[PDB]
Design a protein around this motif. Structure first.
Motif, short mmCIF file in Angstrom:
data_model
loop_
_atom_site.label_atom_id
_atom_site.label_comp_id
_atom_site.label_asym_id
_atom_site.label_seq_id
_atom_site.Cartn_x
_atom_site.Cartn_y
_atom_site.Cartn_z
N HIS A 52 66.15 -3.81 18.18
CA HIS A 52 66.55 -2.47 17.82
C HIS A 52 65.68 -2.20 16.54
N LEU A 53 65.27 -3.24 15.76
CA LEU A 53 64.56 -3.33 14.46
C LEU A 53 63.08 -2.93 14.92
N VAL A 54 62.59 -3.75 16.22
CA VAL A 54 61.31 -3.36 16.75
C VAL A 54 61.10 -1.74 17.26
N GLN A 55 62.37 -1.48 18.02
CA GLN A 55 62.53 -0.09 18.56
C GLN A 55 62.17 0.99 17.26
N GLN A 56 62.77 0.72 16.18
CA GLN A 56 62.63 1.54 14.99
C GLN A 56 61.33 1.56 14.31
N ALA A 57 60.57 0.33 14.33
CA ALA A 57 59.33 0.06 13.89
C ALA A 57 58.50 0.86 14.56
N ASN A 58 58.65 0.75 15.87
CA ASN A 58 57.93 1.72 16.93
C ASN A 58 56.66 1.35 17.20
N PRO A 59 56.23 0.15 17.60
CA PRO A 59 54.72 -0.27 17.72
C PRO A 59 54.14 0.59 18.63
N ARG A 60 52.73 0.81 18.74
CA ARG A 60 51.98 1.41 19.63
C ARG A 60 51.77 0.66 21.23
N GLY A 61 51.77 -0.63 20.79
CA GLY A 61 51.32 -1.49 22.04
C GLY A 61 52.67 -1.95 22.79
N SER A 62 53.85 -1.27 22.51
CA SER A 62 54.90 -1.95 23.09
C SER A 62 55.71 -0.84 23.97
N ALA A 63 55.97 -1.15 25.12
CA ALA A 63 56.59 -0.47 26.16
C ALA A 63 58.27 -0.49 26.17
N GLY A 64 58.56 -0.96 24.89
CA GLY A 64 59.96 -1.04 24.60
C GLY A 64 60.69 -2.52 25.18
N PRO A 65 61.94 -2.64 24.92
CA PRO A 65 62.47 -3.71 25.43
C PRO A 65 62.75 -3.69 26.96
N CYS A 66 63.09 -4.75 27.91
CA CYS A 66 63.40 -4.67 29.21
C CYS A 66 64.49 -5.55 29.57
N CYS A 67 64.75 -5.17 31.01
CA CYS A 67 65.94 -5.59 31.24
C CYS A 67 65.78 -7.08 32.00
N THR A 68 66.41 -8.02 31.24
CA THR A 68 66.35 -9.48 32.05
C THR A 68 67.75 -10.02 31.82
N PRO A 69 67.84 -11.27 32.46
CA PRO A 69 68.97 -11.99 32.48
C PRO A 69 69.51 -12.43 30.82
N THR A 70 70.78 -12.52 30.59
CA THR A 70 71.05 -12.40 29.27
C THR A 70 72.12 -13.90 29.32
N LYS A 71 72.63 -13.89 30.76
CA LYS A 71 73.58 -15.06 30.95
C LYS A 71 73.19 -15.70 32.38
N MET A 72 73.04 -16.95 32.27
CA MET A 72 72.44 -17.75 33.62
C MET A 72 73.38 -18.88 33.87
N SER A 73 73.52 -19.34 35.07
CA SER A 73 74.36 -20.61 35.63
C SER A 73 73.57 -21.27 36.46
N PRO A 74 74.13 -22.52 36.59
CA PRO A 74 73.22 -23.52 37.64
C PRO A 74 74.01 -23.40 38.86
N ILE A 75 73.41 -24.21 39.88
CA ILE A 75 73.76 -24.44 41.12
C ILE A 75 73.66 -25.94 41.45
N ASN A 76 74.36 -26.70 42.29
CA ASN A 76 74.32 -27.74 42.78
C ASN A 76 73.63 -27.75 43.98
N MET A 77 72.53 -28.66 44.25
CA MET A 77 71.66 -28.85 45.21
C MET A 77 71.51 -30.00 45.89
#
Lengths: 108, 108
Positions: A58-83
């Motif tokens: 949110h600090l970068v959002q307020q600083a509002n740089p021209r070359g930024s298309a803002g934050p984006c939607c990615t994983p914040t919690k991941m888990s493993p699987i057994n293989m």
């Protein structure tokens, strides 16, 4: 605490959607088990202050740089699987593989 | 190992750009120190297989769900900064604040 959505959802904001990765459909016979698993994915808008793990965002959002298309939607919690799978050394390997399943989505 | 870019860079792929967050410019007199810091940001395309920390990402790319606009460019390494500030309890607080600086960008 993130949002979960079905495909028909009217939710536009960053959200976790269901998705199955099917190794059999990929033709990956080198994988013995599982043949498929619930992997999920993230999709949706990341407007001001929404679903942000880090104070940075949110600090970068307020600083509002021209070359930024803002934050984006990615994983914040991941888990493993057994293989169980064949390697390239004529062996069958068992392993807990990290970072295979998305459990939560957020904005950064 | 991620990419670092200046603003005039011709690099279109996911990259870390420099950015200073200036608390003084924000008018945030409640922050005593630092007055500004190098925060950086991420921006750029996330094509197939590029800069992916988790095995999940490319599996979902191949599964190719309709409702997904693919992975995107976010921070993959973060660091804290130390801050001295006034709280809302008539005290000056010192703290190491996590998640303030982007050190690397990648695709997920």
């Amino acid at each position: 605490l993130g949002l979960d959505c079905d495909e028909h959802s009217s939710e536009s904001r960053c959200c976790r959607y269901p998705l199955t990765v099917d190794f059999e459909a990929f033709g990956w016979d080198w994988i013995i088990a599982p043949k498929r698993y619930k992997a999920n994915y993230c999709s949706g808008q990341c407007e001001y202050m929404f679903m942000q793990k880090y104070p940075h965002t949110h600090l970068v959002q307020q600083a509002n740089p021209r070359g930024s298309a803002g934050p984006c939607c990615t994983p914040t919690k991941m888990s493993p699987i057994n293989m169980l799978y064949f390697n390239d050394k004529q062996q069958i390997i068992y392993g807990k593989i990290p970072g295979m399943v998305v459990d939560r989505c957020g904005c950064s």
